[PDB]
A paper describes a structure:
The pneumococcal serine rich repeat protein (PsrP), present in 60% of strains capable of causing pneumonia in children, has been identified as a key factor for biofilm formation using in vitro and in vivo models. PsrP belongs to the serine rich repeat protein (SRRP) family found in Gram-positive bacteria. SRRPs are attached to the capsular surface via a cell wall anchoring domain and display a long, highly repetitive and glycosylated C-terminal serine rich-repeat (SRR) region. Although the fold topology of the BR domain of PsrP compared to the other BR domains could not be predicted due to very low sequence similarity, the recently determined crystal structure of the KRT10-binding domain of PsrP (BR187–385) revealed a topology distantly related to the CnaA fold.
However, during purification of the heterologously produced BR187–385, higher oligomer states were formed in the final size exclusion chromatography (SEC) step. Interestingly, these isolated oligomer populations were stable in solution but not in steady-state equilibrium with the monomer, as demonstrated using AUC and SEC. Since stable oligomer formation of PsrP could be relevant for pneumococcal biofilm formation, crystallization trials were set up for the isolated BR187–385 dimer in order to obtain a molecular understanding for stable dimer formation. Therefore, a shorter construct was designed by deleting the seven C-terminal residues in BR187–385 that were not built in the previously determined crystal structure due to missing electron density. Well-diffracting crystals were obtained of the isolated irreversibly associated BR187–378 dimer. Analysis of the crystal structure solved by molecular replacement revealed that the residue stretches L202-G315 (region I) and Y316-S377 (region II) are reciprocally exchanged between two separate chains. This reciprocal exchange of entire protein segments is termed 3D-domain swapping and has been first described for diphtheria toxin. A common feature of domain-swapped oligomers is the requirement to pass a high-energy barrier between the non-swapped and swapped states. Thus, it should be noted that the irreversibly associated dimers were only obtained following heterologous production of the isolated BR protein constructs, and that, at this stage, we remain uncertain about their formation in vivo. Moreover, intermolecular β-sheets are also observed between symmetry-related domain-swapped dimers with similar interfaces and hydrogen bond patterns.
Numbering used by the authors:
A (entry chain A), B (entry chain A): 204 to 379
Amino acid sequence: LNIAKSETKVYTGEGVDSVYRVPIYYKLKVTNDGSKLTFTYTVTYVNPKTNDLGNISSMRPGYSIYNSGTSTQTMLTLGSDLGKPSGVKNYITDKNGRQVLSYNTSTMTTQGSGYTWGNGAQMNGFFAKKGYGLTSSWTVPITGTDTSFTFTPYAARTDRIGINYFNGGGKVVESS
Amino acid sequence: LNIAKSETKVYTGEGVDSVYRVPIYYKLKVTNDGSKLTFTYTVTYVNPKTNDLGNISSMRPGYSIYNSGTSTQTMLTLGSDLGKPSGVKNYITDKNGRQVLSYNTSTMTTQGSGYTWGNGAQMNGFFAKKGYGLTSSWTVPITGTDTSFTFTPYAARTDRIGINYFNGGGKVVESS
Ligand code: NA
Ligand code: NA
Protein backbone atom coordinates (compact mmCIF):
# COMPACT_ATOMS: atom_id res chain seq x y z
CA LEU A 1 0.00 0.00 0.00
CA ASN A 2 3.11 2.17 0.42
CA ILE A 3 2.06 3.49 3.84
CA ALA A 4 4.19 6.37 5.20
CA LYS A 5 7.18 5.18 7.22
CA SER A 6 6.86 8.16 9.55
CA GLU A 7 4.71 11.18 10.40
CA THR A 8 6.01 14.35 11.99
CA LYS A 9 4.33 17.37 13.55
CA VAL A 10 6.02 20.64 14.41
CA TYR A 11 4.68 22.92 17.13
CA THR A 12 5.96 26.43 17.81
CA GLY A 13 5.10 29.15 20.30
CA GLU A 14 6.54 32.18 22.05
CA GLY A 15 7.09 33.92 25.36
CA VAL A 16 9.02 36.94 26.61
CA ASP A 17 12.56 37.23 27.91
CA SER A 18 11.86 39.47 30.92
CA VAL A 19 15.45 40.68 31.20
CA TYR A 20 15.89 41.94 27.65
CA ARG A 21 12.19 42.45 26.84
CA VAL A 22 12.31 40.47 23.61
CA PRO A 23 10.33 37.53 22.28
CA ILE A 24 11.77 34.08 22.95
CA TYR A 25 10.60 31.08 20.94
CA TYR A 26 10.27 27.34 21.18
CA LYS A 27 9.95 24.62 18.58
CA LEU A 28 8.83 21.10 19.34
CA LYS A 29 9.21 18.47 16.66
CA VAL A 30 7.58 15.11 17.26
CA THR A 31 8.13 12.17 14.91
CA ASN A 32 6.15 8.93 14.99
CA ASP A 33 7.63 5.93 13.15
CA GLY A 34 5.20 3.39 14.56
CA SER A 35 7.76 1.96 16.98
CA LYS A 36 8.67 5.12 18.90
CA LEU A 37 8.11 8.86 19.24
CA THR A 38 11.14 11.10 18.67
CA PHE A 39 11.04 14.50 20.36
CA THR A 40 13.21 17.46 19.36
CA TYR A 41 12.85 20.57 21.51
CA THR A 42 14.55 23.87 20.74
CA VAL A 43 14.57 27.21 22.55
CA THR A 44 15.80 30.18 20.51
CA TYR A 45 15.53 33.93 19.92
CA VAL A 46 14.99 33.35 16.19
CA ASN A 47 11.34 33.54 15.11
CA PRO A 48 10.43 30.14 13.58
CA LYS A 49 7.93 31.81 11.25
CA THR A 50 10.14 34.58 9.86
CA ASN A 51 13.56 33.00 10.47
CA ASP A 52 14.60 36.39 11.82
CA LEU A 53 16.60 36.82 15.01
CA GLY A 54 15.11 39.33 17.45
CA ASN A 55 17.11 42.39 18.48
CA ILE A 56 19.35 41.12 21.26
CA SER A 57 22.42 43.19 20.39
CA SER A 58 22.45 44.41 23.98
CA MET A 59 22.44 40.85 25.35
CA ARG A 60 25.67 40.30 27.27
CA PRO A 61 27.77 37.30 26.22
CA GLY A 62 27.70 35.88 29.75
CA TYR A 63 23.90 35.90 29.98
CA SER A 64 22.64 32.31 30.09
CA ILE A 65 19.30 30.49 29.90
CA TYR A 66 18.01 27.01 30.75
CA ASN A 67 15.51 25.16 28.53
CA SER A 68 14.16 23.20 31.49
CA GLY A 69 13.02 23.75 35.07
CA THR A 70 13.44 22.04 38.43
CA SER A 71 12.94 18.33 39.10
CA THR A 72 9.36 19.03 40.17
CA GLN A 73 8.26 21.20 37.24
CA THR A 74 6.71 18.62 34.93
CA MET A 75 7.44 19.26 31.27
CA LEU A 76 6.32 16.02 29.67
CA THR A 77 3.31 13.83 30.40
CA LEU A 78 2.87 10.54 28.55
CA GLY A 79 -0.20 8.44 27.76
CA SER A 80 -0.67 4.84 28.86
CA ASP A 81 0.65 3.19 25.69
CA LEU A 82 3.91 5.15 25.74
CA GLY A 83 6.87 3.53 27.49
CA LYS A 84 9.83 4.91 29.43
CA PRO A 85 11.59 7.95 27.87
CA SER A 86 15.24 7.57 26.81
CA GLY A 87 18.08 9.77 28.03
CA VAL A 88 17.83 13.41 26.95
CA LYS A 89 20.51 14.62 24.53
CA ASN A 90 21.50 18.26 25.01
CA TYR A 91 23.14 20.35 22.30
CA ILE A 92 23.52 23.71 20.59
CA THR A 93 21.95 24.02 17.14
CA ASP A 94 22.62 26.66 14.50
CA LYS A 95 20.03 28.76 12.69
CA ASN A 96 19.18 25.81 10.44
CA GLY A 97 18.83 23.28 13.25
CA ARG A 98 22.21 21.65 12.69
CA GLN A 99 24.30 20.63 15.69
CA VAL A 100 27.16 22.96 16.62
CA LEU A 101 28.25 21.12 19.75
CA SER A 102 26.72 18.86 22.39
CA TYR A 103 26.72 18.87 26.18
CA ASN A 104 26.21 16.06 28.67
CA THR A 105 23.14 13.83 28.36
CA SER A 106 20.40 14.34 30.95
CA THR A 107 18.29 11.74 32.73
CA MET A 108 14.50 11.70 32.78
CA THR A 109 12.98 11.32 36.26
CA THR A 110 9.29 10.49 36.69
CA GLN A 111 6.89 12.41 38.90
CA GLY A 112 4.62 9.37 38.78
CA SER A 113 1.38 8.41 37.05
CA GLY A 114 -1.74 10.36 37.99
CA TYR A 115 -5.16 8.78 38.39
CA THR A 116 -8.80 9.56 39.02
CA TRP A 117 -12.04 7.59 38.98
CA GLY A 118 -15.41 8.40 37.43
CA ASN A 119 -18.97 7.42 38.34
CA GLY A 120 -18.23 8.62 41.85
CA ALA A 121 -20.58 7.41 44.53
CA GLN A 122 -22.31 9.70 47.00
CA MET A 123 -23.53 9.75 50.59
CA ASN A 124 -26.70 11.54 51.67
CA GLY A 125 -27.48 13.44 54.88
CA PHE A 126 -29.67 10.56 56.06
CA PHE A 127 -26.60 8.32 56.18
CA ALA A 128 -24.15 11.01 57.33
CA LYS A 129 -26.27 11.77 60.38
CA LYS A 130 -26.07 8.08 61.36
CA GLY A 131 -22.32 8.53 61.58
CA TYR A 132 -21.84 6.62 58.32
CA GLY A 133 -18.99 7.20 55.89
CA LEU A 134 -18.52 7.19 52.14
CA THR A 135 -15.81 4.67 51.35
CA SER A 136 -13.82 3.72 48.26
CA SER A 137 -11.20 0.99 48.00
CA TRP A 138 -8.79 -0.32 45.38
CA THR A 139 -5.55 -2.27 45.01
CA VAL A 140 -2.26 -1.53 43.24
CA PRO A 141 0.25 -4.23 42.22
CA ILE A 142 3.87 -3.95 43.38
CA THR A 143 6.54 -4.73 40.78
CA GLY A 144 9.69 -3.33 42.40
CA THR A 145 11.22 -1.26 45.20
CA ASP A 146 9.76 2.20 44.51
CA THR A 147 6.25 2.05 45.98
CA SER A 148 5.96 5.78 46.58
CA PHE A 149 2.61 7.51 46.12
CA THR A 150 0.64 10.65 46.86
CA PHE A 151 -3.08 10.89 47.58
CA THR A 152 -5.29 13.98 47.63
CA PRO A 153 -8.54 13.65 49.59
CA TYR A 154 -11.70 15.14 48.10
CA ALA A 155 -15.23 15.94 49.23
CA ALA A 156 -17.86 18.21 47.70
CA ARG A 157 -21.63 18.61 47.60
CA THR A 158 -23.18 16.97 44.55
CA ASP A 159 -24.51 20.20 43.01
CA ARG A 160 -21.14 21.96 43.32
CA ILE A 161 -18.45 19.37 42.64
CA GLY A 162 -15.80 22.03 42.07
CA ILE A 163 -15.48 23.17 45.68
CA ASN A 164 -13.25 20.74 47.61
CA TYR A 165 -14.03 20.72 51.35
CA PHE A 166 -10.44 19.63 52.05
CA ASN A 167 -9.01 22.36 49.78
CA GLY A 168 -5.63 20.63 49.39
CA GLY A 169 -4.59 20.65 53.04
CA GLY A 170 -4.27 17.05 54.19
CA LYS A 171 -2.35 15.60 51.25
CA VAL A 172 -0.88 12.15 51.89
CA VAL A 173 2.67 11.66 50.67
CA GLU A 174 4.69 8.48 50.97
CA SER A 175 8.36 7.88 50.12
CA SER A 176 10.82 6.42 49.12
CA LEU B 1 12.54 -15.19 60.67
CA ASN B 2 8.77 -14.69 61.05
CA ILE B 3 8.71 -11.48 58.99
CA ALA B 4 5.40 -9.57 59.08
CA LYS B 5 2.97 -10.66 56.37
CA SER B 6 1.68 -7.10 56.01
CA GLU B 7 2.21 -3.52 57.15
CA THR B 8 -0.51 -0.90 57.30
CA LYS B 9 -0.50 2.86 57.78
CA VAL B 10 -3.51 5.01 58.56
CA TYR B 11 -3.64 8.68 57.63
CA THR B 12 -6.37 11.08 58.73
CA GLY B 13 -7.08 14.75 58.17
CA GLU B 14 -9.89 17.29 58.10
CA GLY B 15 -11.55 20.07 56.14
CA VAL B 16 -14.73 22.13 56.42
CA ASP B 17 -18.19 21.51 55.02
CA SER B 18 -18.90 25.04 53.74
CA VAL B 19 -22.67 24.54 53.68
CA TYR B 20 -23.15 23.43 57.28
CA ARG B 21 -19.95 24.96 58.70
CA VAL B 22 -18.80 21.76 60.37
CA PRO B 23 -15.59 19.74 60.21
CA ILE B 24 -15.50 16.93 57.66
CA TYR B 25 -12.91 14.17 57.93
CA TYR B 26 -11.05 11.67 55.81
CA LYS B 27 -9.27 8.45 56.62
CA LEU B 28 -6.86 6.72 54.29
CA LYS B 29 -5.73 3.22 55.11
CA VAL B 30 -2.92 1.75 53.05
CA THR B 31 -1.85 -1.88 53.43
CA ASN B 32 1.29 -3.39 51.92
CA ASP B 33 1.48 -7.19 51.71
CA GLY B 34 4.57 -7.29 49.51
CA SER B 35 2.58 -8.17 46.40
CA LYS B 36 0.16 -5.23 46.31
CA LEU B 37 -0.98 -2.05 48.05
CA THR B 38 -4.57 -1.99 49.31
CA PHE B 39 -6.15 1.45 49.68
CA THR B 40 -9.23 2.18 51.79
CA TYR B 41 -10.51 5.75 51.66
CA THR B 42 -13.34 7.06 53.82
CA VAL B 43 -15.02 10.46 54.03
CA THR B 44 -17.13 11.05 57.15
CA TYR B 45 -18.41 13.63 59.65
CA VAL B 46 -17.20 11.47 62.55
CA ASN B 47 -13.87 12.61 64.03
CA PRO B 48 -11.41 9.69 63.66
CA LYS B 49 -9.59 10.77 66.82
CA THR B 50 -12.57 11.15 69.16
CA ASN B 51 -15.04 8.84 67.37
CA ASP B 52 -17.59 11.60 67.87
CA LEU B 53 -19.97 12.74 65.15
CA GLY B 54 -20.02 16.49 64.60
CA ASN B 55 -23.25 18.44 65.08
CA ILE B 56 -25.07 18.00 61.78
CA SER B 57 -28.59 17.75 63.21
CA SER B 58 -29.60 20.53 60.81
CA MET B 59 -28.25 18.62 57.80
CA ARG B 60 -31.15 17.85 55.49
CA PRO B 61 -31.61 14.18 54.53
CA GLY B 62 -31.40 15.02 50.82
CA TYR B 63 -28.04 16.77 51.12
CA SER B 64 -25.39 14.72 49.31
CA ILE B 65 -21.60 14.70 48.95
CA TYR B 66 -19.07 13.13 46.59
CA ASN B 67 -15.75 11.68 47.80
CA SER B 68 -14.09 12.35 44.46
CA GLY B 69 -13.76 15.11 41.88
CA THR B 70 -13.84 15.43 38.10
CA SER B 71 -11.89 13.26 35.66
CA THR B 72 -9.13 15.87 35.58
CA GLN B 73 -8.69 16.41 39.33
CA THR B 74 -5.91 13.95 40.12
CA MET B 75 -6.37 12.20 43.45
CA LEU B 76 -3.77 9.46 43.25
CA THR B 77 -0.23 9.50 41.86
CA LEU B 78 1.80 6.30 41.76
CA GLY B 79 5.54 5.64 41.73
CA SER B 80 7.36 3.77 38.98
CA ASP B 81 7.29 0.33 40.61
CA LEU B 82 3.54 0.41 41.17
CA GLY B 83 1.35 -1.13 38.47
CA LYS B 84 -2.14 -0.36 37.18
CA PRO B 85 -4.81 0.31 39.86
CA SER B 86 -7.78 -2.08 40.08
CA GLY B 87 -11.42 -1.04 39.84
CA VAL B 88 -12.60 1.19 42.69
CA LYS B 89 -15.21 -0.33 45.02
CA ASN B 90 -17.72 2.19 46.39
CA TYR B 91 -19.73 1.61 49.55
CA ILE B 92 -21.28 3.03 52.71
CA THR B 93 -19.57 2.13 55.98
CA ASP B 94 -20.96 2.40 59.49
CA LYS B 95 -19.30 4.11 62.45
CA ASN B 96 -16.99 1.12 62.91
CA GLY B 97 -15.96 0.88 59.26
CA ARG B 98 -18.22 -2.06 58.45
CA GLN B 99 -20.04 -2.14 55.12
CA VAL B 100 -23.71 -1.16 55.19
CA LEU B 101 -24.30 -1.33 51.45
CA SER B 102 -22.31 -0.97 48.24
CA TYR B 103 -22.80 1.02 45.05
CA ASN B 104 -21.46 0.47 41.55
CA THR B 105 -17.72 -0.03 41.04
CA SER B 106 -15.83 2.88 39.47
CA THR B 107 -13.06 2.79 36.88
CA MET B 108 -9.64 4.40 37.31
CA THR B 109 -8.58 6.59 34.37
CA THR B 110 -4.98 7.78 34.06
CA GLN B 111 -3.93 11.38 33.50
CA GLY B 112 -0.58 10.05 32.31
CA SER B 113 2.95 9.82 33.68
CA GLY B 114 4.79 13.08 34.31
CA TYR B 115 8.47 13.57 33.58
CA THR B 116 11.31 16.04 33.93
CA TRP B 117 15.06 15.95 33.35
CA GLY B 118 17.93 17.17 35.52
CA ASN B 119 21.43 18.44 34.69
CA GLY B 120 19.79 20.84 32.27
CA ALA B 121 22.07 22.36 29.68
CA GLN B 122 22.33 26.08 29.01
CA MET B 123 22.93 28.52 26.17
CA ASN B 124 24.87 31.76 26.61
CA GLY B 125 24.34 35.17 25.00
CA PHE B 126 27.38 34.60 22.78
CA PHE B 127 25.57 31.69 21.11
CA ALA B 128 22.08 33.24 21.24
CA LYS B 129 23.27 36.30 19.33
CA LYS B 130 24.54 34.01 16.56
CA GLY B 131 20.96 32.85 16.13
CA TYR B 132 21.76 29.53 17.80
CA GLY B 133 19.28 27.47 19.79
CA LEU B 134 19.34 25.30 22.89
CA THR B 135 18.10 21.87 21.89
CA SER B 136 17.12 18.71 23.74
CA SER B 137 15.98 15.44 22.19
CA TRP B 138 14.71 12.07 23.40
CA THR B 139 12.69 9.06 22.27
CA VAL B 140 9.66 7.28 23.73
CA PRO B 141 8.69 3.68 22.86
CA ILE B 142 5.18 2.95 21.56
CA THR B 143 3.46 -0.13 23.00
CA GLY B 144 -0.17 0.41 21.96
CA THR B 145 -2.78 2.74 20.49
CA ASP B 146 -2.86 5.56 23.07
CA THR B 147 0.16 7.71 22.20
CA SER B 148 -1.25 10.90 23.68
CA PHE B 149 1.07 13.37 25.41
CA THR B 150 1.39 16.91 26.68
CA PHE B 151 4.52 19.06 26.68
CA THR B 152 5.18 22.30 28.54
CA PRO B 153 7.98 24.47 27.13
CA TYR B 154 10.36 26.14 29.58
CA ALA B 155 13.04 28.83 29.50
CA ALA B 156 14.62 30.83 32.31
CA ARG B 157 17.83 32.68 33.09
CA THR B 158 20.31 30.53 35.00
CA ASP B 159 20.32 32.68 38.16
CA ARG B 160 16.52 32.70 38.38
CA ILE B 161 15.30 29.28 37.25
CA GLY B 162 11.87 29.82 38.79
CA ILE B 163 10.63 32.41 36.30
CA ASN B 164 9.42 30.67 33.11
CA TYR B 165 9.65 32.95 30.06
CA PHE B 166 6.81 30.98 28.44
CA ASN B 167 4.66 31.20 31.60
CA GLY B 168 2.42 28.28 30.58
CA GLY B 169 1.01 29.75 27.38
CA GLY B 170 2.11 27.56 24.49
CA LYS B 171 1.39 24.14 25.96
CA VAL B 172 1.47 21.30 23.42
CA VAL B 173 -1.34 18.78 23.74
CA GLU B 174 -1.84 15.73 21.56
CA SER B 175 -4.75 13.28 21.49
CA SER B 176 -6.20 10.63 21.25
NA1 NA C 1 6.39 10.72 43.86
NA1 NA D 1 -3.40 12.94 28.51
